[PDB]
Design a protein around this ligand. Structure first.
Ligand SMILES: Nc1ncnc2c1ncn2[C@@H]1O[C@H](COP(=O)(O)CP(=O)(O)OP(=O)(O)O)[C@@H](O)[C@H]1O
Ligand SMILES: Nc1nc2[nH]c(SCc3ccccc3F)nc2c(=O)[nH]1
Ligand SMILES: [Ca+2]
Ligand SMILES: [Ca+2]
Ligand SMILES: [Ca+2]
Ligand SMILES: [Ca+2]
Ligand SMILES: [Cl-]
Ligand SMILES: [Cl-]
Ligand code: NA
Length: 159
């Protein structure tokens, strides 16, 4: 088994409802168990700002799935919760499940890049991750605690 860390975002169609439904669906992924769920955070949108605030969270998921098999399930859950692709880049969504980390693995396949390419710059990913995994070390040896100590990220507020 490995521990994967999944970021959750939602800013459409009742985010609290979407995220609670997603937690139930994440539990039902085969070969996998949720170990830890963060608090829920209400975060202002980054990138396009003409959209509702997000509910952001993180989950630790122990799994024996292959990384792309986990992606299959997270994409299925998003689609089953009504995620619709629109042409605008980084538009609002009912549910977004990003695989932040998959153990200490560095994955670069056609469908999957892990670590998530921008997570070290996003407080809405890092703060919920630190809540559930304060001792985390990245594949490149960087410590989560050191990033959060050193870099300016705006304060997050709970939902
Ligand atoms: N670590 C990862 N987690 C989830 N999907 C990933 C991924 N690495 C690559 N992908 C790919 O990312 C594709 C596009 O996903 P989107 O959800 O539209 C990007 P987004 O989450 O809106 O922006 P972001 O990646 O800047 O956070 C997916 O279809 C999937 O194949
Ligand atoms: N708060 C919040 N803002 C978001 N913007 C996006 S689109 C990626 C993106 C694009 C540009 C800058 C930062 C980014 F993150 N996703 C979320 C989310 O989950 N939470
Ligand atoms: Ca399971
Ligand atoms: Ca827009
Ligand atoms: Ca995302
Ligand atoms: Ca995504
Ligand atoms: Cl959507
Ligand atoms: Cl890394
Ligand atoms: Na580095």
């Amino acid at each position: 088994m490995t521990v994967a860390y999944i970021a959750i975002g939602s800013n459409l169609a009742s985010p609290l409802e979407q995220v609670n439904a997603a937690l139930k669906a994440l539990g039902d992924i085969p070969e996998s168990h949720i170990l830890t769920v963060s608090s829920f955070y209400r975060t202002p949108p980054l990138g396009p700002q003409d959209q509702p605030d997000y509910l952001n969270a993180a989950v630790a998921l122990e799994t024996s799935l292959a990384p792309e098999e986990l992606l299959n399930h997270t994409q299925r859950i998003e689609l089953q919760q009504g995620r619709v692709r629109k042409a605008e880049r980084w538009g609002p969504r009912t549910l977004d499940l990003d695989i932040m980390l998959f153990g200490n693995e560095v994955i670069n396949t056609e469908r999957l890049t892990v670590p998530h390419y921008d997570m070290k710059n996003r407080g809405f990913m890092l703060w919920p991750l630190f809540e559930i995994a304060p001792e985390l070390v990245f594949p490149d040896g960087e410590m989560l605690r050191q990033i959060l100590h050193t870099r300016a990220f705006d304060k997050l507020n709970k939902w």
